């Protein structure tokens, strides 16, 4: 009773509905969770989002951290199957060696929403859940095609902008936020062309001078700061103040937990909707 599930590092075959799970990320944490499996083991982070709040306890053996598998410990839960998040993929060839493992990301290129889909296809067909996994799906895919329709009926760029220790990057519609582009209909303010892993650097001045209509904003240090303050006091300087989107009531700052860190999760991208109707 094998499936073999299609990922971003391969092809995994394993016997279905493995009974010790590890789970690796908080995307994957998050889509896990909310389809009702729980784990033997997971990462721990600092920032874990409160509707994950149970696994940050020692009820659950720590499995290392977002980018750093603790192998010995891992090795010592006997998995029937290890689920990582992007992050942690550099250590995918290792994993794999200790029990069948799954990469649970989404794809800058088929764009979030149609990979998303397949990631939780995927998680349907390991534990035989399919029928509540497509029930999830209808349901997500009607809001995604709503806001995308309003978006083009209003047809409007948005500027993503990443904010992390001072530094300002921006992301286009083939980054880690096609979302933004591919899925909820909004145009690029400045085409950012062939875009890299991390994002281009920007600064208040550019994003004066370019002027999106909509300003979408991630404040990457709400969770990896001790503190948890408000960017916003900040973000909006004279500068920003002079862009049409402060002026429409359209800066919008994203849930970074959701946009992220939890990339794919269920919750997550319910969030997402959730912000993206809000702006």
């Known amino acids: 009773e094998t499936v073999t599930i299609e990922h971003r590092l391969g092809k995994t075959t394993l016997e279905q509905k493995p009974q010790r799970v590890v789970v690796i990320g908080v995307g994957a944490l998050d889509a896990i969770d909310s389809f ?92 035989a859940i399919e029928p509540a996994v497509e029930a999830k799906i209808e349901q997500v895919d009607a809001q995604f095609k709503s806001i995308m329709q309003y978006n083009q009926q209003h047809k409007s760029d948005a500027m993503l902008v990443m904010s992390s220790g001072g530094n300002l990057t921006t992301f286009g519609a083939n980054s880690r936020f096609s979302s933004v582009y591919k899925d909820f209909g909004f145009s690029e303010t400045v085409p950012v062309s062939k875009e890299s892993s991390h994002g281009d650097l920007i600064s208040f001045e550019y994003i004066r001078e370019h002027n999106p209509k909509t300003l979408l904003v991630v404040d990457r240090d709400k969770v990896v700061t001790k503190g948890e303050t408000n960017i916003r006091q900040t973000f909006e300087n004279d500068l920003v103040k002079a862009t049409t989107a402060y002026k429409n009531g359209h800066i919008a700052y994203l849930d970074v937990n959701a946009w992220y860190i939890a990339i794919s999760g269920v919750k997550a991208t319910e969030q997402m909707v959730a912000d993206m109707k809000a702006s």
Do not use: H
């Open 36 to 127: 009702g499996i729980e784990p033997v083991a997971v990462s721990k982070f600092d920032g874990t989002p409160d509707y994950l709040a149970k696994y940050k306890s020692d009820k659950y053996p720590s499995a290392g951290s977002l980018f750093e598998p603790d192998f010995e410990t891992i090795y010592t839960q006997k998995p029937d199957l290890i689920v990582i998040g992007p992050r942690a993929s550099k250590s995918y060839d290792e994993l794999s060696k200790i029990a069948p493992t799954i990469v649970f990301a989404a794809e800058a290129d088929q764009g979030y929403w149609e990979s998303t889909q397949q990631q939780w296809r995927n998680l349907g067909k390991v534990f």
